Amino acid sequence: SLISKEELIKLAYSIRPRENEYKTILTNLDEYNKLTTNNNENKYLQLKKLNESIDVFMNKYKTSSRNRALSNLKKDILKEVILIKNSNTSPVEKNLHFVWIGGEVSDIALEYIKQWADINAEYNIKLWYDSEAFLVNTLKKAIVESSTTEALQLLEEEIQNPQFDNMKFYKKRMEFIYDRQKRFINYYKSQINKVPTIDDIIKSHLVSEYNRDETVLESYRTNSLRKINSNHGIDIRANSLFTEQELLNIYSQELLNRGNLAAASDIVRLLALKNFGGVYLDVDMLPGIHSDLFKTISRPSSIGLDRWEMIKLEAIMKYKKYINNYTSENFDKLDQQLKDNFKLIIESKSEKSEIFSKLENLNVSDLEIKIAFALGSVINQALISKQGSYLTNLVIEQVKNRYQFLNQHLNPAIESDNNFTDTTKIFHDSLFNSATAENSMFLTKIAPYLQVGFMPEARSTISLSGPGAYASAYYDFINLQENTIEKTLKASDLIEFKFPENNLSQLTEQEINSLWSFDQASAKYQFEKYVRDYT
Ligand SMILES: O=c1ccn([C@@H]2O[C@H](COP(=O)(O)OP(=O)(O)O)[C@@H](O)[C@H]2O)c(=O)[nH]1
Numbered sequence: 051s052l053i054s055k056e057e058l059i060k061l062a063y064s065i066r067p068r069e070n071e072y073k074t075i076l077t078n079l080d081e082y083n084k085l086t087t088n089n090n091e092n093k094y095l096q097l098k099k100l101n102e103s104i105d106v107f108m109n110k111y112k113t114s115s116r117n118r119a120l121s122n123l124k125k126d127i128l129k130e131v132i133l134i135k136n137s138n139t140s141p142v143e144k145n146l147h148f149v150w151i152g153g154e155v156s157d158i159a160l161e162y163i164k165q166w167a168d169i170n171a172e173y174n175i176k177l178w179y180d181s182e183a184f185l186v187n188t189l190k191k192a193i194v195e196s197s198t199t200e201a202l203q204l205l206e207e208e209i210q211n212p213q214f215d216n217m218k219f220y221k222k223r224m225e226f227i228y229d230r231q232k233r234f235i236n237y238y239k240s241q242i243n244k245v246p247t248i249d250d251i252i253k254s255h256l257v258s259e260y261n262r263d264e265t266v267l268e269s270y271r272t273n274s275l276r277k278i279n280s281n282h283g284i285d286i287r288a289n290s291l292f293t294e295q296e297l298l299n300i301y302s303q304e305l306l307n308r309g310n311l312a313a314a315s316d317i318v319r320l321l322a323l324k325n326f327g328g329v330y331l332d333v334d335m336l337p338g339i340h341s342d343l344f345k346t347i348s349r350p351s352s353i354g355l356d357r358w359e360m361i362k363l364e365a366i367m368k369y370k371k372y373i374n375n376y377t378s379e380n381f382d383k384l385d386q387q388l389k390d391n392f393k394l395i396i397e398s399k400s401e402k403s404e405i406f407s408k409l410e411n412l413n414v415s416d417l418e419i420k421i422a423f424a425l426g427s428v429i430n431q432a433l434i435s436k437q438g439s440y441l442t443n444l445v446i447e448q449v450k451n452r453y454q455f456l457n458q459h460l461n462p463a464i465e466s467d468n469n470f471t472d473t474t475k476i477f478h479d480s481l482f483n484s485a486t487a488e489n490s491m492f493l494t495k496i497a498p499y500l501q502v503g504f505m506p507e508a509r510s511t512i513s514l515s516g517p518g519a520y521a522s523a524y525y526d527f528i529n530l531q532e533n534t535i536e537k538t539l540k541a542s543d544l545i546e547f548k549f550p551e552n553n554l555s556q557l558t559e560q561e562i563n564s565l566w567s568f569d570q571a572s573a574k575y576q577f578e579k580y581v582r583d584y585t
């Protein structure tokens with residue numbers, strides 16, 4: 051066990067009589083050692099309480115002779131965390147969570163989900179949706195289309211100049227995008243004083259402001275609702291996932307104010323795991339390839355490890371056709387002897403499960419959450435966690451704490467009723483006065499929050515509901531803290547939380563398509579398409 055109260059008394063000497071903060075430490079040390087409980091969260095919390103009481107002392111008495119022995123004890127506490135999390139492991143609840151909010155779910159997403167279904171016939175599959183918001187994506191399309199045209203009519207004479215910089219286009223368009231969102235939101239607020247749905251209001255707004263037939267829009271709603279209930283769909287609003295008002299407001303400011311489905315989705319995946327436990331997966335993930343499968347086929351030295359994994363999938367698809375119209379462009383580049391060898395291997399396999407791994411058992415700790423990796427960094431596109439896991443609750447806290455930081459400076463900025471430019475200067479001015487050595491990177495990364503999705507290089511979502519929130523919660527757990535903004539674990543500490551590598555295929559056609567590339571070059575590119583399609 052941890053060292054005893056009676057030997058800390060020996061090692062933590064001082065000429066001074068026992069300070070009360072040191073007495074409390076002794077009491078926490080005895081409480082912990084003398085625990086009978088086998089409840090890991092209980093054990094962990096008692097560890098956390100002890101470690102908190104050590105830090106108070108060492109901060110109050112920075113020169114006590116007791117600090118060496120209390121420092122060595124903190125080192126032993128850090129080791130105890132790992133002992134606790136490795137002490138009662140078991141498999142996870144056999145649920146798969148997928149999420150599709152915002153519009154009609156694609157046939158192609160349904161095809162990828164069906165792969166998971168077939169291989170893992172004993173998992174209960176849930177496809178989360180929001181019955182209130184099938185028209186959000188449609189609305190955001192219309193606003194961006196109208197704004198593009200507005201910006202081009204305004205910039206038309208300056209665009210003739212060959213040294214014109216497309217960034218000025220993107221700033222201009224975003225002003226227009228902001229005003230259109232604002233009008234919609236104020237219209238929304240005005241209609242909810244009595245009890246209408248988001249779709250009712252989007253529908254009315256589209257007919258009034260964007261020349262839409264209510265009957266076309268209604269058919270899209272009913273059809274998209276039908277198609278998702280026929281495919282494992284389950285409505286977030288009927289199962290009361292949001293019990294906390296704080297979290298519902300976060301999901302609504304993403305779903306409604308910004309119209310950011312990715313971010314609104316990040317909230318939902320965590321609540322799903324918290325309430326039901328199991329495995330979350332983005333709809334562009336595929337099951338893992340059997341490990342042996344292509345061991346007799348050596349990767350050419352000209353082809354990166356990544357393309358090689360992309361190729362193995364294309365091979366299975368070209369010969370098994372699990373998914374219709376799956377790209378072949380990379381498999382085609384191979385020398386005929388490779389192609390043949392792939393065809394021999396694949397076409398000699400009888401059943402789908404001889405090709406793809408099944409999850410089967412996923413034996414993990416009830417304290418933890420496991421997560422996919424990319425380039426040695428975490429990425430929230432696959433998740434494993436037991437129902438009500440502590441680390442799952444920590445990630446929620448991080449997200450709450452991060453949005454609370456954000457709205458502190460943003461809400462006063464928006465309530466002031468200004469245009470996008472004045473709103474931004476007000477927002478930033480406030481934001482950068484909060485700056486410390488602790489948070490300055492986080493601050494400059496959520497500074498372009500309002501333009502995420504509409505302008506190149508806005509990636510605030512990463513630091514709010516995405517990986518940034520996860521990386522910090524992993525730090526908080528290992529180091530028995532709360533609410534860390536920026537601090538990170540070394541690679542070897544991080545690795546324990548990896549999603550089992552062979553149980554996932556992360557390099558899919560859709561993953562690659564749906565992957566962020568709104569950099570300065572694709573903005574150049576996209577701008578020319580706009581100028582080309584102008585009238
Ligand atoms: O219109 C959308 C697009 C995104 N998503 C959710 O966000 C996840 C990830 O989106 P995407 O793959 O496009 O983003 P990426 O991870 O590549 O940045 C999807 O699996 C969906 O659950 C959604 O619900 N509606």
Ligand SMILES: [Mn+2]
Nearest residue numbers: 334561564565
């Ligand atoms: Mn993706």
